[PDB]
Design a protein around this ligand. Structure first.
Ligand SMILES: Nc1ncnc2c1ncn2[C@@H]1O[C@H](COP(=O)(O)OP(=O)(O)O)[C@@H](O)[C@H]1O
Ligand SMILES: Nc1ncnc2c1ncn2[C@@H]1O[C@H](COP(=O)(O)OP(=O)(O)O)[C@@H](O)[C@H]1O
Lengths: 61, 201, 662, 346
């Protein structure tokens, strides 16, 4: 959360690893963050055979 | 029992002035969207449930009521206090993420108001609060085919928002007009607005 | 079979039966036992095994009478005290220790001695099979009990020191594993405890026991004392036919037992004691009403209801050949204590008008919800009130959403003076908030002496800890782990202050706690509301052994077409809409649910009912209960819209007509 | 002449367009005053009931209770005070020259609906007593139009009040009764024991006409000014209560801060709505479509008026006998929920 806020304020790429493993966090905080700099790109990697990620996050990426 | 042979819901409930207001707000040109919007606006007793995966109705009803509307959510801290202050003030409230329903507002959903003379109060949380009478509650949920409590599902008016063939055709044709001949599309939309305003006049 | 030794001369049980002369009011006492051959034999052998310093596990079908034989054996002895623990689906060791912490002291000589220095303690544990296996197939409670008997002690958790159990005998009780909801039971634990099979009593034995009960009941009505045997035979035959016809295969909650018949006997006693001068027809109708409210409430389908009605007719005709018998339909037996000073049969129209006026007063006073009153909901009011007037009277209302469950409970609680209490359980509410609200409710019931009708909705339970708390609250009179240590001591001080304030004086902790739990059992009624019984959480809530054996299951279900017709007519009768010519259509008798059509109002209610039927058929609802909220909402919107449209059309036509005239 | 029993049948019938909620009697002339749930306020005649004398709509909501009084002074008109659910108390004027209703002043001061209003005169000064749903009973001045004392004597709101001199009672929703002195503004003693909310409560007045419950017991009670009170609740019971004598600005007794149930009268099939006192008789009504008549000497119902109305029975009254300034006319009238009122002649 701190790094996402800082990289939104002052730029810089960020990457998240195995986001299916923090389902409550990705259902609340990341959903709120994407629901609401110019060289800021955030990457998420996930497993196809894992748990079902929320639909609105995937349709907003 | 007799009924109108060529009856249409839009031609009966959705009046021309409200249709103009909706199309000015940003509502799509679809018959389905107009029917759903008129269904939502005609429920003054039970609160309506909005399921819009594109988050379009949030800004549509935001533009309908101007700047007095307030956006709340079930996932933010202090949501109870925000709704308490909003119902004290008397502003239209749209709650986001409706599939994460909070059972505190079950008295507001069921409309089990306790009338106290000329003042109407509701018991929410652990204390009563006055209802201004201008309060209008909307519940929005951008997640389709999710889980909803049976209490809320029974006591609200579920309104879906899905994209049909006519929406795709209209959007594609508008995009190709804008990218091909901007002046022609501008003249077309200006003539459409002028014709509708002339018919209303 | 009947061999025994009296004080070295062999005898039998024929001369050992003590004659029992039950009075009228002794039936309400739950410790009353009818000594038959099997009861005295099982009591004697259980006491003999208990004095042999061994564990006893009483295996048998539900309702066979394990607890009652236990209490019969242990009431006649001052050596043992009964501690009531009733396991749930997920019970922990800490629950067992908390239910024992009140009764025992830690003495270092550790050692967990009983508080009394002369009386041993019997640590009863019911439903041993209900604790569930882990991921690898092991039970904490069962292995804890095996450790508790084989090694006579256990290892304490926080300070990891070994305690020693001195005078805590263990008595278990469980159903056969073949019964659904039970799990196989480990041999390493069952080896240490002797097993007794307490079977179902025979039909003749049940008939004799309940002939004794009906003699005790009919001692109130001396002129009908000679009719005590046909009533018992009819009740036993009705129980046997209900058990044979309605099985577990149809519905999971069709579990009948002699407890249902005992509740029937108690209801008959209450109606007779709170009743006027009685005649034979009144007795037949009262017994039929009690049978309807005990057996036929849990029935779901309409076919089962009609089969039960025909079975009741056959039983009454076969066993009590009395003529001048009225119709015994569900809505034709309206026994009330509202309109009069005593429980007696009342007419339909005056009861409906009284309900109208009292609901108007309730809407004016507490909260304004404009509900429309029909006959079925009046019958539900009567059975809810009958359940609420009882001592320790709980209920489990089951039905579709927006049937009118919580509002009816509030109305009936207001009728009887019950102070309704609903927990404010929501999202981000832990176990501590539920614990606090239950502690506050218990304190208000006991110290403040306030009649409380606590309501627990299915949505008000989020995790199974709340379900286990409700299980402990219903099964016992209170819950042990609410009051531990400092809270326990301050509650004893407060309760002593309340007791000396009332005037009653006693010094022992035990008798004070019995007074406390008696007051809680007398002044606390729990009412459940379940919307969807097909969910796993609701299924576990219904199938809980403590919730099943105490609550009166009231399967209201979805609205039938008669109730829909009644509410539709009584709500649209205030709309001016018969302003057009109508031709009565030629339609089938089965195609019309209402009265045969003469005007447009019956056609409107028929077309709305038919559309609701088609819409719910096309949604693939199956056997899921169907919510009638759509019907009410559509009818209300219809009323408002037709009023507005008629006003607008009349105004427009008047304006254009006067314009043309000008 | 104080031992009158009404006959088993009504003398005549009075019809109102809506349900009746309160009926009062004109002390001087044979005029019956009838309230109405729809806000109407009729004024019929005891002989010519075809048309009302005067009727008007001053309250936008349901009228709750009302009472009448004729002015007297040491240096001459009838006052009618009507309460309703519109948070307003309206005091009327009944002129005898043209028999019409004149509004005097519409008065505020209650944040919720007002249930009972009481009017009384002491030493050539007419005062208004009123209790409402705002948990406060309020004593008023008619000429000034303002309040005189305001306090909360109960946990929640109160139903009915009655005034005997400077002492006022208050029937509350917590099944309690409370005596609160006006000039000191403090409670005297707390009386509880009912299981259902109070519907109508009123004082017991001493008589010199021998009735057991209408006579002084000790000299201290004779000097106090009151000894007994009667309370009607929703327990289907009428209870006669005992008021301990305080150390008269009276001081409450800590060991005698509780009341005592003098007698419990049972036999109504539903809630006891309103009660009345005449001689040794305790006239009462209920929701069982019946009116009873209980003797204070025996505690048994001598007469039962079965099926007097087709529905609920709302209100009834007699004429006050303890006051010599009001003629004890032998009239009785009872108003019910079936939009009808009936009078009893001789
Ligand atoms: N003398 C008796 N012999 C056998 N059963 C009896 C006798 N008296 C009563 N019963 C029945 O036994 C029931 C009590 O069984 P209970 O101990 O609750 O069974 P369970 O232990 O399965 O809950 C009572 O409801 C009563 O109908
Ligand atoms: N006969 C009826 N007529 C009109 N409305 C009804 C009727 N029965 C139930 N309702 C509706 O049901 C609601 C109360 O239902 P409730 O008991 O709260 O359901 P649940 O117990 O599932 O929460 C009320 O708001 C009322 O509008």
């Amino acid at each position: 959360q701190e790094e996402i806020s800082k990289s939104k304020i002052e730029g810089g790429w960020i990457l998240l690893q195995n986001i299916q493993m923090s389902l409550s966090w990705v259902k609340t905080y990341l959903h709120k963050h994407v629901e609401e700099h110019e060289k800021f790109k955030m990457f998420m990697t996930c497993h196809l055979t894992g748990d079902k990620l929320p639909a609105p996050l995937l349709q907003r990426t | 029992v007799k009924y109108d042979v060529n009856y249409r819901f839009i031609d009966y409930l959705v009046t021309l002035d409200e249709k103009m207001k909706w199309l000015e707000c940003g509502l799509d040109k679809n018959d389905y969207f107009l029917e759903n919007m008129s269904i939502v606006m005609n429920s003054q007793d039970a609160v309506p449930f909005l399921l819009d995966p594109s988050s379009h109705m949030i800004t549509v009803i935001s533009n309908y009521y101007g700047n007095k509307t307030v956006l709340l959510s079930f996932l933010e801290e202090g949501f109870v206090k925000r709704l308490e202050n909003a119902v004290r003030f008397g502003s239209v409230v749209i709650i986001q993420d409706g599939e994460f329903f909070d059972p505190i507002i079950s008295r507001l959903i069921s409309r089990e108001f306790n009338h106290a003379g000329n003042r109407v109060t509701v018991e929410i949380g652990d204390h009563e609060v006055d209802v201004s009478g201008d309060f209008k509650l909307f519940i929005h949920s951008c997640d389709p085919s999710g889980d909803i409590p049976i209490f809320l599902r029974s006591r609200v008016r579920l309104v879906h928002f899905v994209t049909n063939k006519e929406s795709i055709e209209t959007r594609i044709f508008d995009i190709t007009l804008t990218e091909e001949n901007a002046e022609m599309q501008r003249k077309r939309e200006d003539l459409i607005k002028l014709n509708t305003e002339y018919r209303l006049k | 079979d009947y061999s025994t030794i009296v004080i070295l001369s062999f005898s039998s049980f024929c001369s050992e039966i003590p004659s029992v002369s039950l009075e009228a009011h002794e039936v309400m006492r739950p410790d009353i036992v009818i000594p038959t051959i099997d009861t005295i034999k099982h009591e004697k052998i259980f006491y003999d095994l208990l004095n042999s310093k061994r564990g006893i596990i009483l295996c048998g079908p539900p309702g066979s009478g394990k607890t009652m034989i236990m209490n019969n054996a242990l009431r006649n002895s001052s050596l043992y005290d009964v501690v009531g623990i009733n396991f749930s689906k997920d019970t922990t060791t800490e629950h067992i220790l908390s239910a024992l912490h009140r009764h025992t002291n830690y003495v270092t000589t550790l050692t967990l001695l009983p508080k009394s220095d002369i009386k041993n303690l019997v640590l009863f544990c019911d439903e041993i099979n209900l604790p569930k296996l882990d991921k690898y197939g092991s039970q904490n409670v069962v292995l804890f009990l095996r450790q508790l008997m084989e090694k006579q002690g256990f290892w304490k958790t926080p300070e990891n020191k070994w305690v020693t159990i001195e005078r805590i005998h263990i008595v278990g009780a469980c159903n056969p594993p073949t019964d659904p909801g039970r799990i196989p039971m480990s041999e390493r634990f069952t080896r240490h405890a002797a097993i007794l099979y307490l079977g179902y009593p025979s039909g003749k034995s049940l008939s004799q026991i309940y002939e004794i009960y009906y003699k005790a009941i009919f001692k109130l009505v001396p002129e009908f004392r000679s009719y005590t045997e046909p009533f018992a035979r009819a009740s036993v035959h009705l129980y046997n036919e209900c058990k044979a016809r309605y099985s577990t295969g149809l519905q999971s909650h069709y579990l009948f037992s002699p407890r249902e018949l005992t509740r029937l006997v108690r209801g008959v006693y209450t109606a007779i004691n709170t009743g006027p001068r009685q005649t034979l027809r009144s007795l037949i109708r009262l017994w039929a009403y009690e049978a309807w409210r005990i057996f036929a409430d849990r029935l779901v389908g309409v076919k089962e209801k009609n089969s039960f009605e025909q079975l009741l007719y056959e039983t009454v005709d076969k066993y009590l050949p009395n003529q001048d018998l009225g119709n015994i339909s569900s809505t034709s037996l309206l026994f009330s204590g509202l309109l009069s000073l005593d429980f007696k049969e009342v007419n339909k129209t005056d009861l409906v008008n009284f309900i109208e006026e009292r609901f108007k007063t309730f809407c004016d006073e507490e909260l304004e919800v404009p509900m429309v009153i029909h006959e079925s909901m009046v019958d539900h009011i009567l059975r809810i009130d009958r359940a609420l007037k009882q001592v320790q009277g709980h209920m489990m209302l089951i039905g579709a959403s927006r049937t009118g469950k919580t509002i009816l409970t509030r109305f009936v609680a207001w009728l009887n003076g019950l102070k309704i209490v609903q927990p404010k359980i929501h999202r981000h509410s832990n176990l501590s908030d539920f614990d606090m609200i239950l502690k506050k409710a218990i304190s208000d019931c006991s110290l403040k002496e306030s009649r409380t009708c606590l309501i627990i909705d299915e949505s008000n339970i989020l995790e199974t800890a709340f379900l286990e708390r409700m299980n402990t609250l219903l099964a016992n009179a209170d819950i042990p782990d609410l009051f531990q240590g400092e809270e326990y001591d301050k509650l004893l001080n407060n309760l002593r202050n309340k007791t000396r304030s009332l005037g009653l004086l006693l010094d022992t902790e035990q008798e004070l706690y019995d007074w406390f739990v008696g007051e809680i059992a007398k002044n606390l009624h729990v009412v459940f509301t379940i919307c969807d019984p097909t969910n796993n959480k609701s299924s576990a809530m219904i199938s809980s052994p403590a919730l099943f054996n105490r609550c009166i299951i009231n399967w209201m279900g979805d609205w039938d077409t008669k109730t829909m017709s009644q509410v539709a007519n009584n709500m649209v009768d205030v709309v001016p809409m018969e302003f057009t010519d109508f031709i009565v259509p030629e339609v089938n008798k089965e195609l019309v649910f209402t009265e045969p059509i003469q005007t447009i109002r019956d056609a409107v209610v028929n077309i709305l009912i038919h559309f609701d039927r088609n819409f719910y058929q096309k949604m693939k609802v199956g056997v899921n209960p169907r919510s009638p909220g759509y019907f009410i909402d559509g009818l209300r919107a219809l009323v408002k819209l037709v009023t507005a449209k008629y006003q607008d059309l009349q105004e427009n036509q008047r304006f254009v007509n006067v314009g043309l005239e000008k | 002449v104080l031992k009158w029993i009404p006959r088993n049948l009504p003398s005549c019938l009075i019809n109102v367009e809506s349900s009746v909620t309160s009926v009062k009697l004109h002390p001087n002339l044979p005029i019956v005053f009838v309230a109405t749930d729809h806000g109407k306020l009729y004024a019929f005649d005891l002989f010519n009931y075809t048309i009302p004398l005067a009727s008007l709509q001053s309250h936008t909501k349901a009228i709750t209770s009302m009472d009448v009084l004729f002015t007297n002074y040491t240096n001459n008109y009838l006052v009618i005070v009507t309460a309703s659910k519109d948070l307003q108390i309206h005091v009327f004027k009944w002129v005898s020259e043209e028999c019409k209703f004149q509004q005097i002043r519409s008065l505020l001061g209650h944040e919720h609906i007002v249930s009972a209003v009481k009017i009384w005169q002491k030493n050539n000064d007419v005062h208004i007593a009123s209790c409402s749903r705002d948990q406060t009973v309020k004593i008023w001045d008619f000429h000034n139009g303002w309040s005189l004392k305001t306090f909360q004597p109960h946990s929640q709101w109160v139903r009915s009040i009655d005034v005997l001199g400077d002492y006022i009672i208050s029937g509350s929703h917590d099944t309690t009764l409370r005596l609160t002195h006006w000039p000191s503004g403090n409670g005297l003693s707390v009386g509880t024991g009912h299981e259902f909310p109070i519907e109508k409560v009123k004082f017991i007045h001493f008589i010199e006409d021998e009735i057991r419950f209408r006579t002084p017991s000790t000299d201290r009670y004779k000097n106090w000014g009151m000894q007994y009170c009667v309370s009607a609740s929703r327990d289907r019971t009428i209870k006669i209560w005992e008021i301990p004598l305080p150390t008269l600005a009276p001081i409450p007794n800590p060991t005698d801060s509780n009341f005592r149930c003098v007698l419990t009268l049972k036999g109504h099939l539903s809630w006891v709505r309103d009660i009345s006192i005449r001689g040794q008789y305790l006239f009462s009504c209920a929701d069982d479509k019946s009116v009873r008549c209980w003797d204070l000497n025996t505690g048994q119902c001598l007469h039962v008026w079965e099926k007097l109305h087709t529905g609920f029975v709302n209100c009834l009254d007699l004429d006050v006998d303890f006051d010599s300034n009001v003629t004890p006319r032998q009239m009785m009238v009872t108003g019910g929920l079936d939009c009808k009122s009936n009078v009893f002649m001789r």
